[PDB]
Structure formats: structure tokens, C-alpha cells
């Protein structure tokens, strides 16, 4: 009706922990669109082209809802789940895509400037026409999505650059923003990113499970880790470094991707087990427990250095059940409630953890920290991003 919808779609390649940077990103622009108009943000639906990325078993299609807490979402900005788009709107039709890309004539010195412009597509477009004329695609899997017109755009600087094209350029109901990791954030650690940082908040039901974990196994529990919590994700303030957390040790092995020549950035299994003992011992430790990627091969030998270690493994029923990004949610949750954590070198996986702890209050000396590479010298710990309320 009064409203138009707002879409977008990253790069394949994407990460589940990367994507969610990009909500930030599109967040940004959404809110500066809202000035204006009256816009909804469309939730693209989890899942990927590249199914063999993730085991899950081929899962596809996802809704927000089995990720985050929606109500808590909209809190933020007005926000709709895309198989609602298709309610609303009359049928799964999106009226301008937008491809994102870099300026052909790319930039010499001198030459920043935030900027966007119509642009011949640097890259072959991947959207084919039908018989109707409409443009078939990927669309988050979803199939009989058909779009009506698309272009490429270069782009520069950070997200709401795009706003007023949005605007005043186009008269369109809907528009979609592909490879949409073309834009920057606003003003990254600002206040207007850590209210939408904020705003996502795991799925009732996955914390529930990470609690049940951390009560269990860990001897953690919200109380017992002097983290006062409320659900209402506004009404949570936390003066920095009140938080205490649970009696053990959270650590994020990232190693899928060693199969990498040299990485000087990555530990051994001998080398990364020491520094968790060191760990341990420093900070009086019980109990470790470990996230990780890693293959069976790895994990076997892990499990030989380290008895004391505990791993969250879901059973398949609960993996096709949380998919991927679930147990993914449910490892970060219990390594940001842990007393001390330390992940691994540029994974924004560790990146999300970060900023989870950095929310509950948790002192960021145990948060921002990672394992070196055995010889890699000049070894350089995480950037602390303190919010900004
Ligand atoms: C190298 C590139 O890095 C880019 O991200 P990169 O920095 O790795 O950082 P991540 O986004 O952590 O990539 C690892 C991905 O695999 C899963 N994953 C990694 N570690 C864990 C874990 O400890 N537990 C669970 N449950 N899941 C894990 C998770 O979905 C995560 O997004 C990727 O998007 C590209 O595909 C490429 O791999
Ligand atoms: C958009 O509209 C404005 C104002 O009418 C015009 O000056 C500008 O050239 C247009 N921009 C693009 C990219 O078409
Ligand atoms: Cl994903």
C-alpha cells in the first residue's frame, strides 16, 4: 500500500556470520530511508546457492525466525519476513534489482569520493529473461520470484549513499539490492550500528538450548555469572566489566580453511592446546569449551590433548532441526558467556562472539583475543569496539 519494500541478496560466497554484518549494513540505509518515506526492510530468507557450503542437508529457504527473535528485530527498524513480502505485495514479484559492483574505471590516489552511479555491469549478469520478459534468478531459492527490471550499479561509500537514488530516482514498489556486500558501514562502531547490533537477539529457542548447555555441562547459569538479563534488548544497559561469567574457558578453533598452503595467522594443535592450558591455569579454569570447524580427523586429536574439553555435538534430528547457522549460534552463545575467551585470527565468527560479549558486559580483556600463529611475529590482537548507547 503507503509502503515500499526493500530487498537484498549477498555474494554466494558469504558466510552465515558475514551476511549478518551486512543486515547491520542494510539497516543503516533503511533507517535513512525512513526519514523520508515509508520503507520495510524484506528479511532475505537464509540458505544458499552453494549447498554443499554448508552439510546441513540441503537447507534452503529458512526464515529469520529460527535465527533471530523478530519482535526484537523490528524493535530497531520495521522489519518482514520475505514469505510475507509475497503476502502483502500481490504475488513474489520485485519491480528493480540493483547489482551492486565496483567502478570500472576503479580509483587512483586521490581519487576516494563516496559516490554511486548507473553503470554498464562490469560483470556478466546472472539474471535470465522468461518467456513473459520477466527476470528469473537465485531469489534465496525461491523459485517463482520474477523481477521486472534490472540494472547494475558502481558503487563507493557506505550504505545510506544509496538513499536518495532510492528516493528520488525510482518510482518502484520493491527493490533489490544484489551483492549488496558492496556497501559500507555508515559509522561503524557507532551508536546507529550498535542499536541494530543489538537488536538481533538469538531465537528464544536456541539460547534456551545454550543455557541448558551452560547449566549442564558448564556450570554456568545467568545468575552464577553475575549477568543480570532482560529480554526487552532496549531495556538492557550494562555498566562495561560488571559481567562476570561462567567458570571455564570459551575458545573458537576456526580451521577449515588451512587446507591453505601457509597461514601464519593459524595455530597448531599442539600450539593452540598450550595456550589453552596456559589460559586455564591463569584464570583458575575448570573447564574449556571449544567451537570449532574442525575436521574429525582434527577434532579426534584435539580430543586426545585436551580430556577436560567440552564441544556442544548436535545429534543430526537437532542439526536438520537448528540448521546450520542454529548450532552456529548456539557455539557463539556459550563461548561469549564464558569468564575469558580467545578465537581465531579474522573470523568473523569470533567477530560476532566479540560483540556478544562486549552487549553482556563481559571485560573486554577476556573478549578480545586470539591464538597465534607458532612463528608469526608481529601478532596482533582484535580491535576492542566498546557500544555506544
Ligand atoms: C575464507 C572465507 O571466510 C569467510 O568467512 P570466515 O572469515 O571464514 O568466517 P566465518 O563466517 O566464521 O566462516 C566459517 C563459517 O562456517 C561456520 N563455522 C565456522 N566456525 C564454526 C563453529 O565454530 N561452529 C559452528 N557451528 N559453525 C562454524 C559458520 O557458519 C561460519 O559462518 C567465508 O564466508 C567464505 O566462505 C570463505 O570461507
Ligand atoms: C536523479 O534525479 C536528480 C534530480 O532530478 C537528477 O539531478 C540526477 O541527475 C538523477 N540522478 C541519476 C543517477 O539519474
Ligand atoms: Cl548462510
Known amino acids: 500500500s503507503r509502503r515500499r519494500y526493500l530487498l537484498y541478496d549477498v555474494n554466494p560466497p558469504a558466510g552465515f556470520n558475514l551476511r549478518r554484518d551486512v543486515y547491520i549494513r542494510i539497516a543503516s540505509l533503511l533507517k535513512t530511508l525512513l526519514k523520508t518515506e515509508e520503507w520495510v526492510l524484506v528479511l532475505p530468507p537464509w540458505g544458499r546457492l552453494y549447498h554443499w557450503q554448508s552439510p546441513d ?49 576503479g580509483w587512483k590516489e586521490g581519487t576516494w569520493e563516496e559516490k554511486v552511479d548507473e553503470r554498464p555491469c562490469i560483470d556478466q549478469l546472472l539474471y535470465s529473461q522468461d518467456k513473459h520478459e520477466y527476470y528469473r534468478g537465485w531469489f534465496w531459492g525461491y523459485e517463482e520470484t520474477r523481477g521486472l527490471n534490472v540494472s547494475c550499479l558502481s558503487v563507493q561509500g557506505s550504505a545510506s549513499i544509496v538513499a536518495p537514488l ?63 538479563f ?54 583458575r579454569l575448570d573447564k574449556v569449551f571449544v567451537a570449532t570447524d574442525a575436521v574429525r580427523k582434527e577434532y579426534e586429536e584435539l580430543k586426545k590433548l585436551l580430556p577436560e574439553m567440552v564441544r556442544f555435538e548436535p545429534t543430526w534430528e537437532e542439526l536438520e532441526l537448528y540448521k546450520d547457522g542454529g548450532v552456529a549460534i548456539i557455539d557463539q552463545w556459550i563461548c561469549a558467556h564464558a569468564r575469558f575467551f580467545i578465537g581465531t585470527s579474522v573470523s568473523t565468527f569470533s567477530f560476532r562472539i566479540h560483540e556478544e560479549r562486549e552487549i553482556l558486559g563481559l571485560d573486554p580483556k577476556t573478549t578480545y583475543n586470539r591464538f597465534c ?17
Open 57 to 105: 542437508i540441503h537447507q534452503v529457504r529458512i526464515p529469520w525466525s529460527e535465527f533471530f527473535d523478530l519482535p526484537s528485530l523490528n524493535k530497531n527498524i520495521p522489519v518482514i519476513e520475505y514469505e510475507q513480502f509475497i503476502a502483502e505485495s500481490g504475488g513474489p514479484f520485485i519491480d528493480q534489482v540493483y547489482v551492486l559492483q565496483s567502478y570500472a574505471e
Open 166 to 228: 532510492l528516493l528520488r530516482n525510482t518510482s518502484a514498489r520493491s527493490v533489490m539490492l544484489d551483492r549488496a556486500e558492496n556497501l559500507l558501514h555508515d559509522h561503524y562502531g557507532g551508536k546507529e550500528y550498535w542499536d541494530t547490533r543489538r537488536s538481533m537477539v538469538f531465537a528464544r529457542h536456541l539460547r534456551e538450548v545454550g543455557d541448558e548447555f551452560r547449566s549442564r555441562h558448564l556450570n554456568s547459569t545467568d545468575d552464577a555469572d553475575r549477568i543480570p
Open 230 to 283: 532482560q529480554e526487552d534488548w532496549m531495556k538492557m544497559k550494562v555498566k562495561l566489566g560488571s559481567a562476570l561469567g561462567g567458570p571455564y574457558l570459551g575458545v573458537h578453533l576456526r580451521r577449515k580453511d588451512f587446507i591453505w598452503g601457509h597461514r601464519q595467522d593459524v595455530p597448531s594443535l599442539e600450539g593452540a592446546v598450550r595456550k589453552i592450558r596456559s589460559l586455564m591455569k591463569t584464570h
Open 373 to 389: 600463529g607458532d612463528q608469526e611475529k608481529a601478532c596482533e590482537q582484535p580491535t576492542h569496539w566498546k557500544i555506544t548507547y
